Amino acid sequence: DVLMTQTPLSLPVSLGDQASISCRSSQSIVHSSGNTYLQWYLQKPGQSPKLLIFKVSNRFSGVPDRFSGSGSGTDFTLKISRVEAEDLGVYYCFQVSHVPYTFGGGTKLEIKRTDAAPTVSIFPPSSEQLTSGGASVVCFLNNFYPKDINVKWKIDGSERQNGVLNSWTDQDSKDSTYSMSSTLTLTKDEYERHNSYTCEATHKTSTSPIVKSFNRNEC
Amino acid sequence: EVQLQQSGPELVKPGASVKISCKASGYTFTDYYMSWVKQSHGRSLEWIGDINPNNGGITYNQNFKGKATLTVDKSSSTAYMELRSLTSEDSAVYYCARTFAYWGLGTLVTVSAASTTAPSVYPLAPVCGGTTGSSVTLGCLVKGYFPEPVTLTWNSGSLSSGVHTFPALLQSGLYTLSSSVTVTSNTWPSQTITCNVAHPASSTKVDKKIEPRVPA
């Protein structure tokens, strides 16, 4: 099978800037007809892929002229001469020269902005959930940049890993930050057996971890 | 215009099978191959195979032999995929496409043993007591529902600035999601803030006022 390798995984740009995306095939992708069937797609969140370029360099239909595709051998490239907000999403290359046809892993085009420190909030289980035998402690880490963040949970000073679920938002359309929700789930019985609960985060905006903690016995 | 209309979302038990359909219009169905593509986790795409509607001849991806069976019905301009012996790995969006240029909207297939399950909805008020700054953050936890989707709004949608609703995750075969809202501290608790949750599949509708935690 032909492996299609796309780089970078994510490409942060400013609106109005040029951008280029690379697609490397692990072997020649020339069909027996002599043509190279390399296609490029844009997929926007919750939407189907949309064809931009077919056969390496042919622009499809009414696709704006700021998009172009090129390449030869095992180097292929998609260029955007001027990035606009409607171009944000994930780009995929796709070879239809050799069976099985294969896709690249995608490149996500995103907005670059200045660093922004997370605003961290921690929430004990609601009294209503306690009556059910489960207990979730929720930590929100909101409006930060860049997207890389590490979150740690401590119970009475000891790291807790089992039962942690993390969920990230997509980039905010107004301020271009990211947010994340981290939930520690335990049994009610266990929750009531311990005192101190800590959400710890490491982000490039601080040389120290951001700590938010509460004690179950404080009120 | 060329149009590919795909069947609606499928909720299938592990080990069962499901048949998906794609109705073509706006062009001559038998003049073009029909192809099927799988997308998992909203990213990785994989080609499944192509069928020639004219003669029924198929070009499969070797890795989907036995898993996927392609057929067509010329009289209704419809292409079919049947997926066999489903597992969690088969939960995905399955697209049909003509010439890899006209794509259907996709059919979500979710494999799960769960029945329809209403969410438990929990209001998340701040830690009791403490100091407040210029702003305050509240939360809402929507735990253990199935299938997707839920809808979640704050003050019936009136409160939209400062909201973050996070993508649902799986936990024990069930979905969980959460949402935070940040308002000026002069706004809450002086004014009411409520999270409104609806889960259509179960006819569940729950409004939870966020109330300050009291000691006693």
Partner: peptide, 19 residues
């Protein structure tokens, strides 16, 4: 399918304008 892709720009240039 490759012969179909060869003919993709038979269509009018009115699709995918908002990409």
């Amino acid at each position: 399918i490759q012969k179909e892709i060869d003919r993709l720009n038979e269509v009018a240039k009115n699709l995918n304008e908002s990409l």
